[PDB]
Amino acid sequence: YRTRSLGVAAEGLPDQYADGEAARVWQLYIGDTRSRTAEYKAWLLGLLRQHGCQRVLDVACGTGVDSIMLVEEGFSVTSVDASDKMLKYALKERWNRRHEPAFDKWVIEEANWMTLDKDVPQEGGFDAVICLGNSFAHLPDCKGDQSEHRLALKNIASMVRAGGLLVIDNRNYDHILSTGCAPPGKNIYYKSDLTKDVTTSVLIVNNKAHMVTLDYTVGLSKFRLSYYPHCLASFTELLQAAFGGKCQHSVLGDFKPYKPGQTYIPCYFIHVLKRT
Amino acid sequence: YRTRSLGVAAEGLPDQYADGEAARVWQLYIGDTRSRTAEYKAWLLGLLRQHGCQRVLDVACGTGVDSIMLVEEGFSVTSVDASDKMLKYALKERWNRRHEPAFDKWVIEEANWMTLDKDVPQEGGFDAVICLGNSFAHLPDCKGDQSEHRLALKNIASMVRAGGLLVIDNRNYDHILSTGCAPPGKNIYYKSDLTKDVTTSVLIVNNKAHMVTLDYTVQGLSKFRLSYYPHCLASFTELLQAAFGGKCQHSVLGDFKPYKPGQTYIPCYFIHVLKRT
Amino acid sequence: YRTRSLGVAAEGLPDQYADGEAARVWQLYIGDTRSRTAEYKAWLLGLLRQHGCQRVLDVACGTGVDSIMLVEEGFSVTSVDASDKMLKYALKERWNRRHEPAFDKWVIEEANWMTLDKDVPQEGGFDAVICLGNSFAHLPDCKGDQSEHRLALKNIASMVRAGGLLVIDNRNYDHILSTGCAPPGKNIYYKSDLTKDVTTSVLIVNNKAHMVTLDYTVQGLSKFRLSYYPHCLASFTELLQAAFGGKCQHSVLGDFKPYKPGQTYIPCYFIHVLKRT
């Protein structure tokens, strides 16, 4: 005897967990990203312009910060996320700036990886599809095999029109697994000026890493966030497979070309594929 | 071990209970409100215009259907709700119509009854504040006295300018308690063309009704639960007076008509109009 | 992720909720039963001996206080309960006194009302089956008709031999519903010397009382919750007849005395004695 079904709202009632002490701290986290690094912007703009990208799909746009840059830089952006809770902030921003012609043109919609094909509006499909900030790692492997990772990837891939780009990244889980730590301050896209401590939890199921759970401490309060530990060799194969190997594929480590065995260990691997 | 804290989202992940069978059926419920009845529109519009209301605050605006009407009729509307889940549909609509001047001027924001004074923007406060559709009954009495009902009301009241209206209703809980049924099809504002069954659950705590919970089945057969505080007429009226310090004129309608104690016709909803003096 | 499945124990680990604040206060409640009133003993012993009862089945025996009396008075008692948590105290007692011949002969076993026929050992079935202290009211009506009440009763009935008694009671739910209070200090079997406050919660589903839940505070101030099905007198009586196919004699006591409809004195408990014919 819950008083309302899980997931139903009520006029003038806060949705189920809005008021919780973890939420009102999680919103500090979701919004401490207000400091794009110079090196990131220079790289992304550089790559999209080099390949002649005009219409861009930004998947898992979150508060839309990456999208907002693209809109400002002259691109034709549609931005999607599954989370209403975060999409709300992008939608807000668009609205304040609804008066600027670029922002009138900015398309923001709900979409889920698992049904991406039905969700997104376009015809032709995009010049580039970007999925940056390690968002793909959010997707759990509940099934057991990786049948959800395969389907999500093939849906994102399908968004890429012949000669177009998929630009997608993962935190260096190779390094994470071997040290057993996901330390703070390592975002290459946005730098935080927030002090944090992180507890790293690695879950190994039947001798295969299966989840990395981060317990953040940041006025002092706790939130939890969880990740699928994508290893470089494996993620690469997953990406190829989404295209049927009809793609060229290169690997960056922190925006610079990556060579197996190099001495510098990157915080993130960034995969750029062009559909052939 | 939860893999994420309750109430935290993840880029590219549905928020906690979005895909549950009760949710994707609740959205069917919450978008039934699509057939405003003729005499509702004619009464509301008539009252606002009788008292010269221009600036209107719509509290718990839900998908914003009542607000959308007001904007379409020329009013200066601001619309609030605590539920992001619902405010989503209103914001959507405004966006589609952002091209019509009236909709550019429509203000939509997050607010909670418990902090309404801080939350809403304005100076100095509305011609009329409308809270209709029985939303106030959504607010539970967790603390046990009715201390929360007192504060909410007092906050809504405070939005009302000198000379202004508070327009606020309740389903007829007197009738509900005495027959122990809150049956379907009774909405006087929007008529459903959806078939439903309702189970009605009345909770009495130490001899005072404390909660009415409704378990809907809707016709693909699916279920959801929604809960209410049972505001009786004599009580709610006192509560409303108290929100104004009695410095108000108050009258009671039953289904849009003047209501008289002991009349034979039993109204589905009581609707309270108060003017601040 | 739970670290162990719900309901599995671990060598050297307390079972799931043993150390919770409500448990270690519930045990204070469940061992209040330590002051049998004089007129209870005198009525029970009197009835059993009037009808020549030797072999007795005590159903929901809890800590076994009623059973311990019967054994001490010379009866052939078997005692059952579904709750391991409670059966623990009875088993303990038997063990301490395992040296007295009467206690060597006392049978104590696990049984569930839903399967009572399979569960209890015997051939051919008891002189009297006693289920007293309002335990039957513990059984919820989850399925909605009273199908479970029917089966339980029918199972208990089946334990009764030709010529035998079923002795079974209910707190007076008629009174409870009509005043909306189940107040403390009313036990006619055991008197507490413990101070308590009770909150009474009545759940009505589609116009039929479906549950009474009691939230106790006990005087170190601690809280626990316990729930009951509200058996009304007219109804429970029909249910009991039906368990025997009407092939039974039935009478109703109010607090150990013959009960007559419309009398002025309002009993705390109704106690039903039925003899199989």
Added chain:
Amino acid sequence: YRTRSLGVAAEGLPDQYADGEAARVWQLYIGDTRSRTAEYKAWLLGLLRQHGCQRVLDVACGTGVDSIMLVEEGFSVTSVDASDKMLKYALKERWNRRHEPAFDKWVIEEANWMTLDKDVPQEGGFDAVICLGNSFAHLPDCKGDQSEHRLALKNIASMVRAGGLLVIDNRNYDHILSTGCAPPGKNIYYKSDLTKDVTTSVLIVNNKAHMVTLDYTVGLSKFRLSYYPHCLASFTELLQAAFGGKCQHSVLGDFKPYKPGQTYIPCYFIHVLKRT
């Protein structure tokens, strides 16, 4: 609106989770131990007799199987566990055999590691205290440091009278961690004739192993059980510390003397300490 507080029972009502599909399968597990191995009995009896043990405390006795043997072999046994749910089976057995003088004399009681000193009845304290079958591993480290392991051990230690034995064991977590598997069929005390599959989950917190969770499949149904991963070097130190190093201490691997670096890898380490 739970209808009754968590952990309260009701005359003629099954305690909270008794009826669950995991429980009625867990009882198959708790009772598939009806086949003591010959080698175990020969070792334990041998050791207790060698040191002249008469009064024995069996901690975490579970269904009492080890205790029942001791009672049958002539010892003065008191047997304790925290779990009513399992203690119930020992108590049962005693009762059926209450007629045999040895079983009249058998003391069975409730006790918790954390308060063992107050819980157990004795004066002098025991000739040997046995905690076998890997039960100590059941005790989680919720605190974070190992302050509960330290207190439990010092309580068990305190049960041992001058010149007496603590005999206590752990599954080989060294091996478990390094292979990432806790496979079935490896009990050296009791052999199962039950077919099982096990999923092994290792949880590493801040680079220190913290939990091993076993999901059993055994008519096919699932239960879960969890363990603290005690490593040999560390557990040894913990045991010494419980005595203040005023103890001699040897290590067996599967009942045979254990030598660091030997080629045979044991399933269990068994610690025998004598208080000096």
